Design a protein around this ligand. Structure first.
Ligand code: A1BJC
Length: 324
């Protein structure tokens, strides 16, 4: 028997289709995982191939929690540390944020989705340390999910990284993974620091997780990620009534012919709830919205909200706070 929950599958399908229609987008996908087992509760794509497993995207800002996790886990950074987040150069490349903040603490880097702050965290580590961490999250690794045509994604050897590439990989460019790989990587945060295998079969034995970060680090990162869905974060459209939700938005210019183009984007929204003791991960991507807005928050945040909210209801998880 499949691990798929048909009521979640139905909800995800309807919500995805509504958003793809409304935003006149090219394509999209939803993955729902069990946060403590890695079982696939739902996996839906717009018509055609199984893009969730076959296609690789650059994660963009959806990678930033991992860079933050690695920093905190090393003991070298505390969440209250403040960083200079002004634009700066690497060789003759510029790292800069959409909206300039002079300084941000780690909570701020998460909340506001700072490229500069993320790159400063990664710059405390060597290429080999960062590569090993991305590898350990499963980037460029086969999941062996049972799906045919499953991509391993792309993680170039650290032996060939330029300094700019370390920076850009820390905020999610130059490495690639499927939506299912990206949802899987979030089990590190939900399953107390251990990466889980993904499966579409009902589990019979407790899955063997592989330790990537300390449980204390995973807990802290989940707490920081609630900032994304509260006032001041990029991801308030994904807030769910009655729960605290940890999430990350991602808005990427689309890589098309080796070029990154400024008039095509890919919107990603990934999160988990309840944030303190999560039951589910929901990941959403919509490719090339064209109806006006293209930011993750407006395009994918409402599908995340409805699928997460509906999923928690279906699985019989009580709200942790009064509905409003
Ligand atoms: B990230 O996705 O977080 C966000 C979000 C969000 O949280 O939803 C919204 C807006 C900006 C950002 C910053 C993060 N994304 C970006 O920085 C985007 N960057 C890129 O697409 N690229 C392409 C490739 N390279 C070289 C490898 C880059 O350095 C790079 O940064 C981004 C997103 C939107 C824009 P636009 O079109 O609105 O100007 C530009 C860049």
């Amino acid at each position: 028997a499949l691990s798929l929950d048909q009521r979640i599958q139905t909800l995800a399908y309807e919500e995805l289709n509504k958003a793809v229609e409304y935003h006149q987008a090219k394509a999209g996908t939803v993955v729902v995982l069990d946060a403590r087992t890695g079982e696939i509760l739902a996996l839906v794509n717009t018509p055609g191939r199984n893009r969730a497993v076959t296609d690789m995207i650059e994660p963009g800002s959806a990678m930033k929690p991992f860079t933050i996790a690695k920093a905190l886990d090393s003991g070298k950074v505390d969440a209250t540390d403040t960083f200079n987040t002004l634009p700066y150069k690497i060789g003759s490349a510029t790292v800069q944020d959409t909206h300039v903040y002079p300084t941000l603490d780690v909570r701020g880097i998460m909340q506001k989705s700072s490229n500069v702050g993320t790159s400063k965290l990664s710059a405390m580590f060597t290429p080999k340390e960062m590569y090993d961490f991305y590898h350990d999250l499963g980037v460029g690794v086969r999941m062996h999910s049972g799906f045919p045509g499953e991509t391993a994604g792309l993680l170039r050897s650290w032996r060939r990284w330029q300094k700019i590439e370390q920076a850009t990989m820390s905020f999610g460019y130059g490495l690639q993974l499927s939506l299912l790989q990206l949802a899987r990587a979030y089990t590190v945060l939900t399953h107390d620091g251990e990466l889980l295998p993904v499966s579409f079969e009902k589990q019979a034995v407790a899955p063997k997780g592989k330790r990537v970060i300390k449980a204390s680090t995973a807990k802290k990162v989940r707490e920081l990620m609630v900032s994304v869905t509260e006032a001041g974060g990029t991801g308030t459209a994904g807030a769910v009534d009655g729960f605290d939700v940890g999430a990350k938005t991602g808005t990427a210019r689309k890589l098309v012919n080796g070029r990154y183009v400024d008039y095509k984007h890919v919107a990603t929204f990934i999160g988990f709830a309840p944030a303190k003791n999560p039951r589910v991960i929901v990941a959403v991507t919509i490719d090339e919205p064209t109806a006006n807005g293209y930011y993750s928050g407006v395009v994918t945040g409402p599908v995340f909200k409805q699928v997460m909210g509906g999923s928690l209801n279906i699985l019989g998880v009580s709200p942790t706070k009064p509905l409003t």
